[PDB]
């Protein structure tokens, strides 16, 4: 996703192209709301 | 239609709510924010080193202290002054005078559209020369950390270290250009567009963060020191975001009335 | 054995714009988890439709406008839909708007009352379609699409500017004033005077709010300009 | 027919960290066993796990702290806690650190008594978060994070410095106190005096040990400094 | 590993009728309807076979 | 279609190659007709 | 394994890319152990 | 000449693993060639005349 035109094809793993976040043990949706 | 504005909440209409019409089609999505903020920018314009260097003192600094300057380029949207981090933009409007001049920088773009409080994302460098047929290579180290100084002797010949390290360092052939990615290293969890705390616990400077960046880059010519010549050069760097995320509104600048 | 292969004019060429990555130095590196922090934005309208205000000269800049006692026929405030015009400068929807080149939808505006409870009065909002000469009179005024609007219990009423264009997009900024820019006029009349108790103060004041629309969009990234920062 | 392909902006760079390998020239060859070689290291950590001694000022260094017999209220030794402080210097966990940038992770620190078997006491062990001035007395060290010790049978006693900070991973040197390097002090306090029998050495000595916790944890190398060579 | 390769003796030609397309820069791009336009012309043979006058010399 | 010769590969999505129409909710034919 | 990103393809052959030895005919184990 | 990183960071007592070498110029626009021999050998030292 994003302005990436590739569709088919990754060379290197994900883990070493991306920065992932360690584990631990449609339309828009509103903003501020009132009740 | 009859609404109360008071209540901070209010429903976005049509043209049909109170007269005959229709809604219109979607169109296209070019406001995402992911798909916005992967375009290369220029950042900053630093010279390149012939030698061992000296990095700059903090900001106390009084005269006749000896070091280099204007070497050094931060990885970061936010003001920088001096090869380190600032809270308030400058500009010198009267080129004259004693006392050495700062360099400057700033993310025009990502500040005339700073609309949020919190950003993250990973970063992608380029370099381009600015000098017909120039060779020379690039260095970095990651955030919180220091560049180290000295230098050894082969055959009589000095030899900077920052030639060697466990953390990249690339060359390009003659014209070429460098390019390559790096991740989010900081020890913060996000990236502050604005701030408005302290990081030492007593005589802090507030709203001024610590680590707000990605690391340091510079530029040398590989060459031993006994080959310093005359004239200075000059390196252009670019940078773009990559896979961005933002997390709370904002405001924008103040376009001045003429 | 080697692959043959003949490489395209366009090679070593840098462009800024290309929808490709490129090679890692320092992978393998896992970050913090970002979970706790609330209200990610993914779309830059989920900002550009929420109301701000505009501003007016009061010859030096104030957002209201003070509701005068004097008798006249021309309107009581008009100014033109462009969302280059300073009106909508400082605004999230001009603001925003300035940034890229084309745009779609219908814009939306609102008004709040915030004069004394005992007053009483009605206003008359209409919008103009491109003329030779912009609307000078109430007889010219109700011809055109407008709405009345009368002081009551609720404070707040608004008003949204339909979408007729000759063509799909308009631009988003007025080098000369072609059909696919400028778009007619808005103009706001007093249809009669308001009425107030004794001892109370007189010239209520009338507040304004700009924002985008339901089916708002905007296209086609411009770079922006820098000037903010002298 | 030949695959047309342009080369990207990025060609003939080398790059020292790149994750991927080259061409080989002389391949084919087979290599001895090494089967009969024992206890290969697969982490750095196994290292970082045992402890070792750290290193005090007599005034010219010893590992040892001798406890006097005069009496004061001050605390018997305290030193703070950052990796690149000179006390952790020589230790493994410092050595190793300082080839690094980041941490997680508890500390573990122990003690040894050397003293005669018929000696008889009491210490006091505290550690206090970060504040505007350093604990200084019995009273204001008890209400942070402490624990009793007493001599007994066993001789060696281990204590754990919890990881707390504002933010996950820190810094492993410290340019500047920032809270995100420095996280605070170390310090032993004499509960009661040494009580010894008629004809015997006065002055016992005590022993310290630093080591890693069991969730202790390393990232992102860096460059090592060579001046241990001169 | 790398893969090997050779290019051949034609490379870096700029060739203007060559049957190949190239590397976009702007894409993501959307564009309004054109289905009301009606007569579309797919080849020039329909317009050749229209008749036309001739000329010749009143000297 | 087209001058156009590959007809095995396409690497970049066809939303990047191409500009799109946004939807909204043989024998050449002659032109100009009797009746 | 390693600081090696490719994990799709390899050319040459595992006996020309490394090195072998020639036949004869999880958490971290602890070193030092007590009785 | 000496390993800086390397014995910086020994912590062991044996070691083994395969190498790869590069070689950069240090003099504009050079035409050089680089050769090597296995453990254990000796470097041939004559010349043969052509023409
Ligand atoms: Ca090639």
């Known amino acids: 996703r994003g302005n990436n035109g590739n569709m088919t094809f990754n060379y290197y793993a994900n883990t070493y192209q991306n920065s992932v976040d360690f584990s631990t043990s449609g339309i828009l949706n509103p903003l501020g709301y009132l009740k | 239609s009859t609404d109360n504005a008071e209540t901070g909440v209010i429903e976005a209409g049509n043209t049909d709510t109170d007269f005959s019409g229709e809604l219109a089609a979607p169109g296209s999505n070019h406001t995402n924010v992911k798909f916005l903020f992967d375009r290369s920018r220029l950042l900053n314009v630093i010279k390149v080193l012939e030698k061992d260097a ?36 400058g500009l010198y409007a009267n080129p004259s005078g004693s006392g050495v001049l700062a360099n400057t920088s700033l993310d025009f773009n990502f500040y005339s559209l700073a609309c949020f409080t919190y950003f993250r994302s990973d970063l992608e460098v380029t370099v381009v020369s600015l000098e017909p047929d120039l060779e020379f290579a690039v260095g970095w180290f990651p955030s919180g950390s220091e560049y180290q100084a000295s230098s050894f002797v082969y055959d009589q010949l000095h030899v900077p270290f920052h030639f060697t390290g466990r953390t990249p360092r690339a060359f390009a052939s003659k014209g070429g250009k460098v390019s390559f990615v790096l991740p989010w290293n900081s020890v913060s969890s996000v990236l502050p567009v604005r701030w408005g705390g302290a990081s030492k616990l007593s005589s802090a400077t507030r709203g001024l963060p610590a680590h707000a960046d990605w690391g340091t880059i510079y530029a040398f010519v590989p060459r031993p020191n006994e080959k310093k010549s005359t004239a200075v050069k000059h390196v252009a760097v670019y940078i773009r975001y990559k896979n961005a995320r933002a997390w709370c509104p904002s405001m924008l600048p103040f376009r001045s009335y003429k | 054995g080697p692959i043959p292969t003949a490489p395209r004019e366009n090679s070593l060429m840098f462009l800024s714009t290309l929808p490709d990555d490129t090679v890692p130095a320092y992978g393998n590196v896992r970050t913090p988890p970002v979970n706790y922090l609330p209200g990610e934005i993914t779309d830059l309208l989920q900002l550009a439709r929420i109301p701000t205000l505009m501003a007016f000269e009061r010859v030096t800049y104030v957002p209201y406008v003070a509701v005068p006692t004097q008798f006249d026929d021309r309107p009581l405030i008009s100014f033109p839909i462009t969302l280059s015009d300073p009106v909508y400068q400082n605004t999230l929807v001009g603001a925003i708007s300035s940034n890229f080149a084309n745009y779609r939808g219908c814009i939306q505006i609102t008004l709040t009352f915030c004069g004394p409870m005992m007053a009483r009065g009605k206003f008359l909002l209409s919008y103009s379609p491109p003329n030779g000469t912009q609307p000078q009179t109430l007889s010219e005024a109700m011809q055109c699409t407008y709405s009345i609007w009368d002081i009551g219990l609720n404070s707040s009423w608004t008003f949204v500017v339909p979408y007729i264009s000759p063509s799909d997009y308009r631009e988003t900024r007025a080098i000369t004033n072609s059909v696919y820019s400028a778009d007619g006029w808005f103009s706001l009349h007093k249809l009669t005077k308001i009425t107030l108790p004794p001892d109370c103060p007189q010239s209520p004041c009338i507040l304004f709010f700009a924002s985008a629309g339901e089916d708002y969009t905007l296209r086609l990234p411009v770079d922006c300009n820098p000037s903010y920062v002298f």
């Open chain 2, 54 to 89: 000296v990095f700059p003192r903090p900001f106390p600094t009084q005269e006749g202290a000896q070091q280099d300057d204007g070497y050094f380029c931060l990885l970061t949207p936010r003001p920088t002054v001096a090869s380190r981090p600032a809270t308030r933009f």
